[PDB]
Design a protein around this ligand. Structure first.
Ligand SMILES: [Cl-]
Ligand SMILES: [Cl-]
Ligand SMILES: [Cl-]
Ligand SMILES: [Cl-]
Ligand SMILES: [Cl-]
Ligand SMILES: [Cl-]
Ligand SMILES: [Cl-]
Ligand SMILES: [Cl-]
Ligand code: NA
Length: 129
């Protein structure tokens, strides 16, 4: 599923992500924009052999099981395929664990490089929320 901008903002808010760990909704929409262009089916291989999955490009080295990432963990206790669903529940629940891990949203390199410090409220501007 390819979400619209305000559609994803509303789904993220319904699943409790708005101001989760102090990160406003626009931070989450901005990260999803540059991780996946709002496409739940996005996948991307990493040089280390792990793979990133879903709207927030959650990585198989630590967070989900895909059966082909040697030495990895599955700390969200989910198959990585669950992160590609049109229903964003699994991605949101796992992102809550990731953002709580110690470094906040810097866990998402693209958030640090393209969202951090910017006018992230622009990503939810105009949306009925
Ligand atoms: Cl957009
Ligand atoms: Cl918010
Ligand atoms: Cl915001
Ligand atoms: Cl594995
Ligand atoms: Cl594990
Ligand atoms: Cl599994
Ligand atoms: Cl959803
Ligand atoms: Cl933080
Ligand atoms: Na894994």
């Amino acid at each position: 599923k390819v979400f619209g901008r305000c559609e994803l903002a509303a789904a993220m808010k319904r699943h409790g992500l708005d101001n989760y760990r102090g990160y406003s909704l626009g931070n989450w929409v901005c990260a999803a924009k540059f991780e996946s262009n709002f496409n739940t089916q996005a996948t991307n291989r990493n040089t280390d052999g792990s793979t990133d999955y879903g709207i927030l490009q959650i990585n198989s080295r630590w967070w989900c099981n895909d059966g082909r990432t040697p030495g990895s963990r599955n700390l969200c206790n989910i198959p990585c395929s669950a992160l590609l669903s049109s229903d964003i529940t699994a991605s949101v629940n796992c992102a809550k664990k990731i953002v709580s891990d110690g470094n906040g949203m810097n866990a998402w390199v693209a958030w640090r490089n393209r969202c951090k410090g910017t006018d992230v409220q622009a990503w939810i501007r105009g949306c009925r929320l």
